[PDB]
Amino acid sequence: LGVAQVGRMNFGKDVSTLKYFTICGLQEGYEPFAVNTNRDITMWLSKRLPQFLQVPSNHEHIEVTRIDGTIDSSPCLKVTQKSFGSQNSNTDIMFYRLSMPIECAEVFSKRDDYDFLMQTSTYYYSVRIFPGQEPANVWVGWITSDFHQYDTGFDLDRVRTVTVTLGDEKGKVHESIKRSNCYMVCAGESMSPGQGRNNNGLEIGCVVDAASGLLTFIANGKELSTYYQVEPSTKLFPAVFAQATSPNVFQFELGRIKNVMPLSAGLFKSEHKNPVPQCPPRLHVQFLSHVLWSRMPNQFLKVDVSRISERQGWLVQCLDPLQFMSLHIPEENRSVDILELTEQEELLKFHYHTLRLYSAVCALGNHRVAHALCSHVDEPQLLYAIENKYMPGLLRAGYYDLLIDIHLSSYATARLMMNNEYIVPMTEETKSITLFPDENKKHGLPGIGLSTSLRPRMQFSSPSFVSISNECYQYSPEFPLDILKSKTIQMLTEAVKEGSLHARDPVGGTTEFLFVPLIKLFYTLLIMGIFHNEDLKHILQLIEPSVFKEAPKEGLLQMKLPEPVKLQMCLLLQYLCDCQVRHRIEAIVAFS
Amino acid sequence: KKSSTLQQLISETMVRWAQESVIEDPELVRAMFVLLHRQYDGIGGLVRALPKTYTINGVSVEDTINLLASLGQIRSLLSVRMGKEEEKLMIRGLGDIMNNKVFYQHPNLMRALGMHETVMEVMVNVLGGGESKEITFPKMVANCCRFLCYFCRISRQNQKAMFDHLSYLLENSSVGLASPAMRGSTPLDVAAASVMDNNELALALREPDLEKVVRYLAGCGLQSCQMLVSKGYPDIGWNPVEGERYLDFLRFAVFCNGESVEE
Amino acid sequence: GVEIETISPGDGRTFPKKGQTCVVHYTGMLQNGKKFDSSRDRNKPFKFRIGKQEVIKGFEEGAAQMSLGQRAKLTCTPDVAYGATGHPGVIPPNATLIFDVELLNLE
Amino acid sequence: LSKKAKASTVDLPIESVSLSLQDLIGYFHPPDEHLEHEDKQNRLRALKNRQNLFQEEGMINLVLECIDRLHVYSSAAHFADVAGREAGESWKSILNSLYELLAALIRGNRKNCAQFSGSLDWLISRLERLEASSGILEVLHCVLVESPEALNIIKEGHIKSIISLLDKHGRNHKVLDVLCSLCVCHGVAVRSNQHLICDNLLPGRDLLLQTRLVNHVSSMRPNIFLGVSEGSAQYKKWYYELMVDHTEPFVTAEATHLRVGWASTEGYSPYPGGGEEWGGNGVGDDLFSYGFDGLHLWSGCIARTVSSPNQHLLRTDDVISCCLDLSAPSISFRINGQPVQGMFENFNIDGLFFPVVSFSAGIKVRFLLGGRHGEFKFLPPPGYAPCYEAVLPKEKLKVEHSREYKQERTYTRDLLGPTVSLTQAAFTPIPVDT
Amino acid sequence: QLILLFSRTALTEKCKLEEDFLYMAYADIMAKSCHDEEVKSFEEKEMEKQKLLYQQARLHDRGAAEMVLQTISASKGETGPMVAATLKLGIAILNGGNSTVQQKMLDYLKEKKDVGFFQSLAGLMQSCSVLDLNAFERQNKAEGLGMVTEEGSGEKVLQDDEFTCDLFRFLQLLCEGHNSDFQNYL
């Protein structure tokens, strides 16, 4: 879509809305794109705000090389212009930043000396503007996560700034706070001697005091007048903005100066006490780019706007709740919608394996670890992941597995372990137990009935972290079992009807992703025994309508399931047979 | 006609799946055929279940529930790596079981639940772990051995059920024989209590298992005690401490109820 | 070591006293802004007894100074909240905790 | 070479070692899956016999010695300096091939992985170096998945080194898989490993990606686009009020969102700058918006507590009056008629400004824009003009979505391209020079 | 598919033949479906022979002979219920001197060059039990002192006569009909 251009694309989810398909496109044998899709197609657009991403190895202009640090040389990252001096060379200003930020202290305090180095919080990095690179076109300093300004002409005057002045009751301004996303200086103005010197490249050094928030710059061994004071807990990314006037533009030098700690000691918490400069592989140069996609939300907040009268003005009303699940990247201080991982492969894989690790650390009844994990992944996140239809299949399976492992697996395993033993107390209701419901020798619905055999006891503990007791670390964390049961039945009812239509878009992208996690959760609940009476009737009706009808539509058993789903159905039928055997054993004990 | 029965429905579904598709998953094939065989072997389910069926009086329901909870804790400890807290939990569970009344009043339920076997696999795992470096977690091994000896003393049939596993206890008898204050709490002591004062079990006792004990006694008579010389005891050529253990086991093997089993 | 800031006013007359349970909804956050606990996530009002050392101290004095129906933010320094050792697996060592606590009912 | 003998006198069979290492990797290559069951089983039998013979001849320790001699030199350039350039280009390849050969020798062999436990401690000590990280991690994964004794001997220091590998080398799912193998092996859970991994990884919340539920926040703004520029005909003082008819403090598990104030546009475009169209971001979550939630002044996603009489979060029946002064950049608020002791000053005035409210679900608010668009409950400060006076003579004032996409049918949704600049908002008279 | 599953399980290399209840049950079902077990006329005898041939064909047309050879080979000379069921199935499919099954077994053995099969046969013969005077006298004394045996079989003497007879009947059925090929191959 061009400037001031408006368009509409119809994917033909409703064939009736297509206005020219019948006259041209239906008879020819073509199909609407959303011919038999149950839900709307996710819509992706070009992102407006530029973001910082690692420089591709195949970038036509920018080349970044990592010079390892020797005994006498600091580790260096060198940014070079590949296509300088040739046609298609890009002359505009590039914005460069490093991947990891320096995080200032939460509360501000109010021959190098080893003790000073070990007690200090001051960190340093320096930049060598190479000879022949025009220094007035190069800026060095720090930026925050808010920097998304892409301008062909960048000047320090047009940086985004705000000054919050908190005053007392009488009006005196007792405190003034200056806030900005960019804290950088120019090399052209930094050069007091000026011109080009090849004894050493123009070396602006950035000094950050994490305990005071003071940003001071040193150019060629003399401190520049420009200084910045930042807010507590500010995350500052080393950044260099430069316009290429030579094949060699600038170089990040991760060294250290007298009594000032290296950048790695602040970036990495493992190297917090290591004065030796380091450039771990995680650190890498990132650049601002427009080449990224943005995902349109499937559903937006419903807002009603209207003017009641001249007196009342305009009314804005939003009364229906809507939530999205946000994935926060810790290193970049960036958060994205978890549904955007459908097109981001590396984050999807890493998060699926993180979910696997979450399931593994609490495996086989580690109730304390499960309680700890309840903080990281909670009931609302679990329920939203379970119910959401646009969740990627891998994340869907992982979240079903995590929900089963944290809350349900311990008691499910306990009842499975006690399943093959029949300790039947001999009571009045036990005597009342009979093989058949009535004189007609017709089997009752499996599971439904009066069972008196001794069963394991269900106990759960509320995962509260303000409490200082330790008795809660036995027993699995509590979950809203009634809500889980109702939602599982509702989701199975939806899945049976929708999958039979054989839609192009199942939940998770495949029938296996749609059914295996859902049927596994249903089987876990059945094994635990939450399903009682009417729930058992409905679920058996779903499994096979004809057989389990009380004394059309096809069930799960005859809907052409994949092999993994068939294995789960076999497990369900095995459990039903086990229930019938238990009923038989109890009836024999009753007769005895 | 409609299936109208879970058995018929499952049989038809399994055969129908198998004849529609060549199943690529061996686990799926085995699950389907196990389920079909269960449908066609309804008698076998009762044959399997009835020996594991027990009826308890209404007065002991909660007490049996507590015993079952303790046994479930012990059974769940089978699937975790051995450690300090696992040792503490196992010792507490065994103590609760031994102090519980059903363990005494209903020895048949105890055998049906396979509690002695579970204690056996726990002890097997701990004995296998760190076999060369003396024995790790000696306290819970001693506790399990005491529990097992008491299980032998509870009932005669429990003694035979424990006797059925005497073979293993003999090759792992040489565990805590040298260490004092562990006497009466070793696999050799468990094996001895497995045949203590039982003519039928003494007669069923074989020749090779006696030969194994004689071999261990010969080894103790030939070579000294590495643990004792490491702790600094003077190096005499032979091992009286373990020799006496093997001798008293042979004493229990050959002498029963005041008479001598000549065989 | 605890300060109280009011989000929503209370009655200002009823305060927790000895032997009286406090029913609250809380949302705990660290200074970095990451949530770690919320009874609102659990749909489950939290009940504890004043003076029975049932919760962390900072929470205890925060609830004590709060009034009925009041919504207040509790900033609990490490000395009164989990100390230097922290909570294994949840709270990092030497962490200051921010709580959004609403005193529902005193009973 | 280590003892410093002259390079030509020392013979270093680099090419033969590399070619033999390729031959050995092919010789220990695992069978492919597409082969039939019988052929697969026979080839597994042959591989098992080969591994058993090699381990009985002690070929693992030989590989370990070669690896140690190669790690004596710290880098490819260092090795090239000590021995020569020809060994220099091949140092990395020989290390990779040796690690692959070790992995092939120990893979699937329980006895070999059990005998490699003694050397596992030496193996992890070199995990940090980049020239051997992948190979060492693969060997460690094979030993962990095969031999239970590996999990028995792995200690807290080894677990912490493996965890710090994630921090130093970045996100790698193979480290997570190795950690899962450390937790569960052959259906047996190691409680010590589980507890150590949990307590050393989870509390940081700096390596693993974090998840949370955020309420959607939508922004509504009037039609007016007011700014300041030199030699231009627009008033530099403006005033409007927002009064809340109803608000629900907790419609969900998360607190409701309700922020009011002014927002700016990047340049002369009608587009709210510095923020994303959809998400949980509202007024004051960027350096282009300036908000007030009843207790905090919001700007740049950072909040500062501002005092006010009977200070509280925005409740039902609360009047918020917003003041904007473009002569000297100043945004001030007055709650229920009494002043709020704080203001935004010295912000960017290059772009156009407009009133804006950001909200989650559970609100009921009303704009009092002055004139016939609502009557101010409180008298405007002197010199301020009601916001209804900024409407263009031909246009009609209306409150609409700040962002261009809203809730509607997908096939009826109006996809919008870039808009044209609104430089017409600032009428700067420019007669020709004479 | 069931026979192929069992054959693949047998052909997988493991240090010991694991006890599989599915195999132990379905092998018995298969053997019974084959054998299905006063004067009878010639027509009755011929019909019985034809029915037995058809019932044996239903299995050896689907890999039963190769399955029972593979299970014995993977047994590695260990006596147990697995080989007890496998030998019974082999007897069931070989009853009547089935030349087709004999040829199939010989062809499979020659093609695969299976030494483990014959090694396992030698091991099973070595592990076969005989009369035990010591056990007999011990159980006689146990009965004399009055301790009644819980099991009336008293199978300590002649441990597995059914297994021994089944093994040697299988090895005889391999050579019935004057099968010179097996007579020389054994």
Numbering used by the authors:
A (entry chain A): 1207 to 1316, 1414 to 1854, 1889 to 1929
B (entry chain A): 2053 to 2315
C (entry chain E): 2 to 108
D (entry chain A): 436 to 869
E (entry chain A): 3666 to 3702, 3710 to 3858
What do the study's own words say?
Here, we present the cryo-EM structures of the post-translationally modified RyR2-S2808D in the presence of low non-activating Ca2+, conditions that resemble those of RyR2 in failing hearts during diastole. We determined the cryo-EM structures of the RyR2-S2808D channels under conditions that resemble diastole in the heart when cardiomyocytes are at rest (concentration of free cytosolic Ca2+ below 150 nM and ATP in the mM range). Under these conditions, we found that the pore of the RyR2-S2808D channels with irreversible oxidative modifications remained closed, but the cytoplasmic shell showed a downward-outward movement compared to the closed WT RyR2, similar to that of the PKA-phosphorylated RyR2. The subprimed state would lower the activation barrier of the channel facilitating SR Ca2+ leak. The calstabin-2 affinity for RyR2-S2808D was similar to that of dephosphorylated CPVT channels, consistent with a similar degree of the subprimed state.
Ryanodine receptor type 2 (RyR2), an intracellular Ca2+ release channel located on the sarcoplasmic reticulum (SR) of cardiomyocytes, is essential for cardiac muscle excitation-contraction coupling. Structurally, RyR2 is a 2.3 MDa homotetramer consisting of two functional regions: a massive cytoplasmic region, also known as the cytoplasmic shell, which comprises several regulatory domains (NTDs, NSol, SPRYs, RYs, JSol, and BSol domains) and the stabilizing subunit calstabin-2, and an activation core and pore region, which comprises the Ca2+ binding site and the transmembrane domains. Dysregulation of Ca2+ handling, characterized by aberrant SR Ca2+ leak, is a pivotal pathophysiological mechanism in a spectrum of cardiac disorders, including heart failure (HF), atrial fibrillation, catecholaminergic polymorphic ventricular tachycardia (CPVT), and other arrhythmogenic disorders. Here, we solved the cryogenic electron microscopy structures of ryanodine receptor 2 variants linked either to heart failure or inherited sudden cardiac death.
